Design a protein around this ligand. Structure first.
Ligand SMILES: *Cc1c(COP(=O)(O)O)cnc(C)c1O
Ligand SMILES: *Cc1c(COP(=O)(O)O)cnc(C)c1O
Lengths: 418, 420
């Protein structure tokens, strides 16, 4: 029985763009002062459980002592040094850690400033590879109809220049493919493979594209087709990587390895922008031994040592958790607590996988109404379209997670009153 | 005799910028940095003449940058910018609007310079669509520019990569007057093409990665007038020039013009971390915002990162505390005096200095393996490209440090040319 009204920072409101709002926005942004654990804290002292982990990334929560200490240790040596002609121990130590954990066969690492740049580099690698392999007709990309891979211009092109699309994979993590579905994908490759440098996909969970979960069988078939038809499989694990689907990398659900993989977000525990593009040795060698041996990208802050150092700490934490058990427990609690939402007339369905839960509504969320329910219930959630979803941090306790899910179910129920 | 540290894991597994894997020459392992120096794993200090690619303008391990980082870490390294804001974003924004060219009023924080450029181009396209000039859907630049390595930025850099429009590289020389023929050609380009152009993008005064070229403020003044008269947005990429590099805080100041859109980065954070911003006029922000597509269609996950904002506040406060014009005029004077004798060397074409940039342009491309073997023993780190041996030292460098750097550089260049 409440509505909470936040106070507008006039400077923000007039002068600063934010990702999904006009300038000025119709409704002001909430000023956050600090954060700790699973909580963000408003300028007035109100603590809110961040159910979003700051868009998938803050998987250890906020103000983590180990992450902070790792950042500070590196700071005392150097925040940054250029990577042209120079290297450093954080880059080396991170690289060794990554090669020890990522899907087998990935052997070369291109550090990037952001996920979208990692994707741009993945696409460039694939193009240069095919040119080096003397298959210059293989100059386009394919994806499924429901994907998302970043907001830079090349990434935009395979998000739902011209590219090629197949059906969105069928919804349902436990659903078996049909013969018709298998044949259609196969037919797509028979028809188009000579034009395709690569097929790019988010493995298992398609995020910004609709929070869709699909079968590992789809990925298994895709891997086999890419093998037989000489198309590189590019797995965008920027959102899924480091545990989110219930395995360390979502590719593991299918027990496949991609030719190229992008990672980011949870890589640094959400502390700072950073990403990487990994490839096989075959790709790195083929390019490197070609007429164009240099990979034609190089961000100014490539390899940033501070990002590398926090990433080492973040990976060590993930490995320490028993990430499969942790996320299995998260899934079980979110499913139990949120399943009763289906009782509500304006709810379509509820679906949980690993450390992701989605309450899909029948109609688009009216954001101000929903949010004016947020503060009074002690939580922060950011819907998109018809989706009210959470991606909580792996450090969340059972009691904290229960509090978050009970609060969310109260918010959704109260919202569906208006 | 110096033995530097190298690393077999790096050599086999880590890509470096625009490099093969493995590279033909190994990377030097850096352990730490302090002041103007980088320090190898074996303890060898090298003056970094590059400021880590234009950005480390206060040097390394600066106590005020470090303090800003530590202070923000105690509060939060990061929080999402969707529906939320924070004081570092606000305070940085206020600082920026106080110093940037007049008319810039709206700020889009970005993860990197390349993304800032991508966002600038998108703003310009959305603006023309909102203004009901949807034919204005292409971009122009000069030959010899550089604006980042992402796919849209690549297209304005000198079927699947989109076509754009180019004019001649501006004439070399900061003090050079334009000719009537040069004025007419540029004008003719606008008469011909302006109905197709959403914007004209350029690095003001100094064109960096494209050739370390200096050109006249008269050129930028003419371009601003043409863009005004022909309804083409002027996009000034100040990612490298911003915060003092050309001898003014922003290189646009040489021409006493303001762009419609400006990108900044690099020195913005004192080179501590990747971060950038795209600024526009109110007219652009409003016109989009009041259109059928009111939302600017970009949003990196780490947009507005508070840690980056907090170190950028500290970096700007430092720049404002310097007399940036006097500091860079003194740097120019020293670099010119110390490096001018290079022109007497067979295989040097010319030497040019402007503000805190010095370029020794050679007749032939630098043979990098040879060049590398002279660095360590002379106590400096410089990274040539093409035919160019250039430095962009930090604003904190002392007269004696800068003298040491330039005398060492002249010794390296001289020994390189006779070996080549
Ligand atoms: C977030 C995301 C990206 C983009 O990373 P940014 O850091 O926003 O540039 C790319 N791909 C996927 C799957 C992501 O979730
Ligand atoms: C460095 C630079 C960029 C690119 O910034 P990144 O951080 O490498 O993406 C864009 N424009 C200019 C003028 C620059 O110097």
């Amino acid at each position: 029985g409440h509505m909470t009204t936040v106070s507008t920072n006039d400077f923000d409101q007039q002068h600063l763009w934010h990702p999904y709002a006009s300038l000025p926005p119709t409704y002001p942004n909430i000023v956050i002062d600090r954060a700790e654990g699973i909580y963000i804290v408003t300028e007035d002292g109100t603590r809110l459980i961040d159910g979003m982990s700051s868009w998938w990334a803050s998987v250890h929560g906020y103000n983590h002592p180990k992450l902070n200490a790792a950042m500070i240790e590196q700071l005392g040596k150097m925040a940054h040094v250029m990577f042209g002609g120079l290297t450093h121990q954080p880059a080396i130590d991170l690289g060794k850690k990554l090669l020890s954990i990522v899907p087998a066969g990935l052997d070369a690492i291109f550090y990037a400033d952001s996920g979208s740049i990692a994707v741009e580099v993945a696409l460039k690698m694939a193009l240069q590879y095919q040119i080096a392999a003397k298959r210059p007709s293989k100059c386009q990309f394919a994806s499924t109809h429901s994907g998302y891979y970043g907001d830079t211009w090349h990434a935009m092109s395979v998000c739902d220049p011209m590219q090629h699309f197949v059906a969105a994979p069928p919804m349902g993590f436990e659903r078996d493919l049909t013969q018709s579905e298998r044949e259609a994908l196969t037919e797509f490759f028979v028809k188009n493979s000579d034009k395709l440098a690569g097929f790019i996909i988010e493995p298992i969970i398609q995020g910004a594209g609709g929070m869709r979960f699909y079968s590992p069988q789809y990925l298994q078939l895709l891997r086999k087709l890419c093998d037989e038809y000489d198309v590189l499989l590019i797995a965008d694990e920027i959102a899924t990587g480091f545990g989110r689907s219930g395995k360390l990398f979502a590719c593991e659900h299918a027990a496949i390895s991609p030719d190229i993989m992008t990672i980011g977000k949870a890589l640094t525990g959400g502390y700072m922008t950073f990403a990487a593009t990994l490839s096989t040795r075959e790709i790195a060698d083929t390019i490197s031994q070609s007429d164009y041996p240099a990979l034609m990208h190089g961000p100014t802050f490539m390899g940033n040592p501070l990002a590398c150092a926090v990433a080492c700490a973040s990976i060590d934490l993930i490995v320490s958790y028993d990430i499969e058990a942790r996320t299995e427990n998260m899934q079980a609690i979110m499913n139990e607590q949120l399943a009763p939402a289906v009782s509500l007339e304006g709810v379509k369905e509820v679906r949980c996988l690993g450390a992701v839960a989605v309450i899909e509504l029948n109609e688009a969320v009216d954001m101000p109404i929903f949010q004016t329910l947020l503060i009074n219930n002690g939580i922060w959630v950011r819907p998109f379209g018809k989706l009210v979803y959470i991606m909580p941090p792996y450090v969340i306790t059972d009691d904290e997670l229960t509090t978050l899910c009970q609060a969310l179910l109260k918010v959704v129920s109260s919202y569906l009153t208006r």
